[PDB]
Amino acid sequence: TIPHLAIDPFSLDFFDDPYPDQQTLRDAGPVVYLDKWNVYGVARYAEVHAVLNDPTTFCSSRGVGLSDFKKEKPWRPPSLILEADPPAHTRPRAVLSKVLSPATMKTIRDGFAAAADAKVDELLQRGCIDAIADLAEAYPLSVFPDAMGLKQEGREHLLPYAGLVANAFGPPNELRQTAIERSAPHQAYVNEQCQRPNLAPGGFGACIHAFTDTGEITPDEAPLLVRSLLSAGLQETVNGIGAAVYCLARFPGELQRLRSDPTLARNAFEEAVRFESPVQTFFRTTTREVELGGAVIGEGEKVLMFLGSANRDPRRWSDPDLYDITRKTSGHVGFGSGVHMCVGQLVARLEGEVMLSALARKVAAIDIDGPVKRRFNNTLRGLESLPVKLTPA
Ligand code: HEM
Ligand SMILES: COc1ccc(C(=O)O)cc1
Numbered sequence: 575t576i577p578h579l580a581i582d583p584f585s586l587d588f589f590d591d592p593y594p595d596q597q598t599l600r601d602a603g604p605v606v607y608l609d610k611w612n613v614y615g616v617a618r619y620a621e622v623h624a625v626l627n628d629p630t631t632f633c634s635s636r637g638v639g640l641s642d643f644k645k646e647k648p649w650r651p652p653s654l655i656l657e658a659d660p661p662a663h664t665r666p667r668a669v670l671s672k673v674l675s676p677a678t679m680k681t682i683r684d685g686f687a688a689a690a691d692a693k694v695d696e697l698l699q700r701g702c703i704d705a706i707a708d709l710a711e712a713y714p715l716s717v718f719p720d721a722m723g724l725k726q727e728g729r730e731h732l733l734p735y736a737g738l739v740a741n742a743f744g745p746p747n748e749l750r751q752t753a754i755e756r757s758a759p760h761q762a763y764v765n766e767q768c769q770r771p772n773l774a775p776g777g778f779g780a781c782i783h784a785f786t787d788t789g790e791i792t793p794d795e796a797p798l799l800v801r802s803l804l805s806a807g808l809q810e811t812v813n814g815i816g817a818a819v820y821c822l823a824r825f826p827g828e829l830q831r832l833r834s835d836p837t838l839a840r841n842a843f844e845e846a847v848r849f850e851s852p853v854q855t856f857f858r859t860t861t862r863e864v865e866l867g868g869a870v871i872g873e874g875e876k877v878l879m880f881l882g883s884a885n886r887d888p889r890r891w892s893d894p895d896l897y898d899i900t901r902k903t904s905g906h907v908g909f910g911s912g913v914h915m916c917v918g919q920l921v922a923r924l925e926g927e928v929m930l931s932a933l934a935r936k937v938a939a940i941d942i943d944g945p946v947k948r949r950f951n952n953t954l955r956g957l958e959s960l961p962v963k964l965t966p967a
């Protein structure tokens with residue numbers, strides 16, 4: 575009854591151009607079985623949204639990667655928020671939500687915007703830049719580690735550790751094996767920065783350790799919660815900003831609309847998150863026999879959600895392949911959906927908005943003038959290099 579497919583969604587072939595295979599996964603049926611990895615898959619918006627919003631059936635405490643924590647050991651101690659289910663997830667989630675609160679965004683917005691404006695001004699003096707290393711990577715690295723309270727030394731481990739975590743969600747392929755082989759130095763840095771004395775006062779990390787006396791988390795849980803903010807978000811935001819610059823370069827009429835109304839910057843980044851979906855996939859594990867899209871999925875089965883495919887499902891989106899900065903983007907699953915919906919989404923949207931705002935006010939044209947290179951990762955989609963020429967307004 576359930577179509578069986580041989581598509582490997584974690585192959586370099588798939589990463590190079592996933593969109594034809596994603597339609598095949600969508601059009602095969604609401605639920606498919608991936609014989610390569612022995613998991614169920616949902617690629618349409620409806621089923622992806624349904625699975626995300628049923629955490630009691632499709633749990634996260636057995637791992638949101640391929641590995642079932644009931645069968646194998648996790649490569650690192652489980653996340654207290656990402657790899658936890660309610661009610662154990664609830665109170666650590668509330669702490670991270672208040673650490674990255676709307677009030678916190680108000681405290682840091684003016685500084686995040688000034689750094690975004692300064693970066694664009696600097697890049698316009700060079701003209702020909704790499705929109706990834708010099709822009710998409712350079713700007714979040716200039717605001718987020720400081721907002722975190724991290725020391726200056728050792729920040730070169732942040733992006734490698736981010737890519738290691740994302741690769742470790744994947745199947746035991748070469749990308750995952752090689753990432754774990756290289757992991758020890760990045761792992762040693764991150765865990766040490768999670769200790770209270772190593773986090774600057776007023777920053778995100780210090781605020782987590784200060785939240786350890788309310789009955790929501792204990793002092794021994796704060797290091798792992800700081801680890802969550804060092805394991806997630808940085809590369810996704812970089813890939814989201816890099817995809818926005820790439821889209822504005824290939825859809826030049828959308829850059830012209832953004833220039834004419836810079837207040838579209840926030841939705842221009844939100845559309846880039848849907849268009850690119852920096853987090854392509856996440857797993858769930860069934861705690862029960864469940865019926866999903868006419869399929870009967872047994873207990874203890876892994877279910878692979880195609881977030882990027884759900885954001886390009888023509889059953890849900892009109893012209894899903896087009897970058898449209900005025901599209902009604904509400905409802906996209908680029909940040910997930912439900913109780914686990916990205917707790918750091920306000921940080922990412924703040925960084926993305928103020929960067930696109932600086933581009934909208936200061937840049938007249940963005941022209942690709944070099945070979946574009948894609949970075950391969952078991953979980954993340956993003957560009958490695960994006961040579962562009964910036965023309966000042
Ligand atoms: C474009 C930027 C981002 C994207 C596309 C993204 C993607 C996602 C997605 C899809 C989830 C859902 C996980 C699940 O359902 O299992 C998630 C959760 C999470 N994200 Fe993000 N994220 C972004 C930015 C950030 C930032 C800036 C931070 C931290 C400062 C962050 C930290 C987290 C954490 C801690 C979780 C776990 C929340 C939970 O399990 O309740 N992310 N992210
Ligand atoms: C990439 O998405 C995430 C989200 C949370 C965590 C974590 O809590 O460690 C890691 C990766």
Ligand SMILES: [Cl-]
Nearest residue numbers: 650651761764
């Ligand atoms: Cl780790």
